[PDB]
Design a protein around this ligand. Structure first.
Ligand code: MMN
Ligand code: MMN
Ligand code: MN
Ligand code: MN
Lengths: 348, 348
């Protein structure tokens, strides 16, 4: 589809590269470092390349009004939830160090100016901007000036709305990705709309395309890889028993491995062209294709026709079924036995 | 993508319909009715809708030359293999009756004129033409005149080659499907080229598009459903222990069920548009979107600016982050407390 690409550290991302799966524990650790470390351990052992976090600083990402609003996947204010799961600066710094001590790449999502500045201090290789901030241009402008590539989720936003952010990013001069997404926890299959990825790619030809997902399984993501997605994001947990509003739609070690295996197979199987000639098929063609044979005994001098000629496998005869009709009207240069392939020496 | 459709009995096929999985036991029964019945039983219990067979009549589908050619997935002549697995007419008639006694649809693939005529006598609802016969125009012409819809595999053939057959089909006036395919048993992921489906759909806009597959698993087919495939074909067996050249790439009860479940999820998740508004996302938008707040204490009379104004969740403030800049230069109609959302009554 395209050859757009950029790097997240030493990891190349793009259509012509192995798709990247981002394991986001997000707020899954419920504010506990011990839990966060156990989830990072699971991610490592499962074979994860990237672990994404969520950088929350309650007072800077939301005003008092947030103490009165409830998210769709919970029964208490988003403020209460965030004040409960948020890791302070020192703890998040240890989390990043720990992820990296496991040989994995650490990136996070800022939801405020203060968070962006903290992550800049930490010098992460790339910045993820959540669908909720996709239309938060002043914040996008700040992040873009950091000079690192941006992975922008586009849920809850139209192409035109997204256009403004992409313009700010290009202005900044940093490479970027666009992840189609639907922000319902969990998300039903009917709301996914994989076609949205093509809408994004056609609208922004220089963008790396992927999918951020919240369904209950891997189907959406596998479908995204088949469509050309280069980046895949699903929340992640060490085990599905855990409490938390995003746990239900999270993938675990076993499911991650399945997504990774399926992503590899689909990276290989996708795209290509119908007319491409595949050498491996030759022995099949040589026996399956039909050649022109005699449908009846034909005496020398008699005319060949669609009545005394037919076609049968294999494809080694002097005349291929594609040439069947060109033989009509020709003259038998000798007696032709029924069932025999028609050879060049059989006609005048 | 399109609304093309047609029926195989009472089963509607097309992009806007549940994708159809064709379980082809083909030659998997190794010529044994008992084995064929056991495989049909497995297909039934697994939840299969269609069972496809292969109608072989050795003397009519191939000349003596075939006794000297070996297929890629075997070590004996294709003639020997077919003479070994071929079911005579009476037995195949019992097979069709048995499939139907299980409430499933029976269709088959003819490889000769005699086979086509036998299946016409049996009055099957639709005809499958294998990739090997995709370029066998005289045979396609015969089948098309039967007045039933055609499912045409297109492996080993270019778009131009396929063009001739599609023309013959349209001429005949029957609806048809085009299954992208690669004929190597088994087929590696890299040879699949799912993009071939789009090449087929763009070249033949009135065709129902699907995929016939020979890889070792469901990934290719699941990818095809994500791309818009309406028909999926994989060889089928009751168990992977069975002997036979096509067994290795066949799906079994458990894998069929997986393909069927994944096909359903992907039918729901595919297509759609990026700009489509999803009601379920509203509660997320209401809390995640940012509103303009005061970044500092602003005294009445003072001018609002990008220095004393900022943005924070939630999205219920009088001014959305999208309107952030329009507030620049405005005059505070009263003292504005730091951290408070900017309201319409705060400016002159
Ligand atoms: C919109 C947003 O910030 N979503 C994030 C990332 O997907 C979620 O983790 C929410 O913070 C969470 O669902 C709130 O309960
Ligand atoms: C080309 C062809 O006829 N292929 C059929 C259907 O895919 C196969 O079943 C072969 O008859 C088989 O692989 C021969 O060994
Ligand atoms: Mn998410
Ligand atoms: Mn096949």
């Amino acid at each position: 589809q395209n050859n757009n690409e950029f790097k997240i550290g030493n990891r190349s991302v793009g259509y012509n590269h192995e798709p990247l799966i981002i394991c986001e524990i997000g707020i899954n650790h419920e504010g506990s470092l011990k839990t966060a470390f156990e989830m990072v351990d699971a991610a490592y052992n499962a074979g994860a390349e990237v672990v994404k976090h969520q950088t929350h600083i309650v007072e800077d990402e939301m005003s008092d009004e947030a103490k009165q609003v409830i998210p769709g996947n919970a029964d208490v204010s988003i403020y209460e939830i965030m004040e409960r799961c948020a890791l302070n600066e020192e703890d998040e710094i240890k989390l990043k160090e720990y992820v990296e001590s496991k040989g994995m790449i650490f990136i996070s999502t800022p939801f405020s100016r203060a968070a962006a500045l903290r992550l800049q201090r930490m010098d992460i290789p790339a910045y993820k901007i959540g669908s909720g901030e996709c239309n938060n241009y002043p914040l996008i402008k700040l992040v873009a000036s950091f000079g690192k590539p941006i992975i922008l989720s586009t849920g809850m936003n139209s192409i035109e709305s997204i256009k403004k952010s992409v313009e700010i990013i290009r202005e900044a001069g940093v490479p970027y990705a666009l992840l189609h997404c639907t922000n319902i926890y969990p998300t039903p299959y009917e709301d996914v709309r994989l076609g949205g990825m093509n809408d994004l790619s056609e609208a922004f030809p220089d963008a790396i395309i992927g999918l951020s997902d919240h369904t209950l399984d891997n189907y959406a993501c596998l479908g995204a890889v088949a469509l050309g997605g280069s980046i895949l994001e699903r929340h992640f947990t060490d085990r599905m028993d855990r409490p938390g509003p995003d746990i239900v739609c999270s993938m675990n070690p076993d499911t991650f491995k399945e997504l990774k295996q399926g992503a590899h197979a689909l990276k290989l199987a996708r795209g290509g062209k119908k007319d491409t000639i595949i050498a491996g098929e030759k022995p099949t063609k040589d026996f399956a294709f039909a050649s022109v044979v005699a449908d009846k005994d034909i005496k020398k001098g008699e005319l060949l026709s669609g009545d005394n000629l037919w076609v049968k496998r294999p494809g080694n005869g002097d005349f291929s079924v594609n040439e069947y009709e060109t033989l009509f009207g020709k003259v038998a240069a000798c007696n032709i036995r029924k069932g025999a392939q028609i050879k060049k020496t059989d006609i005048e």
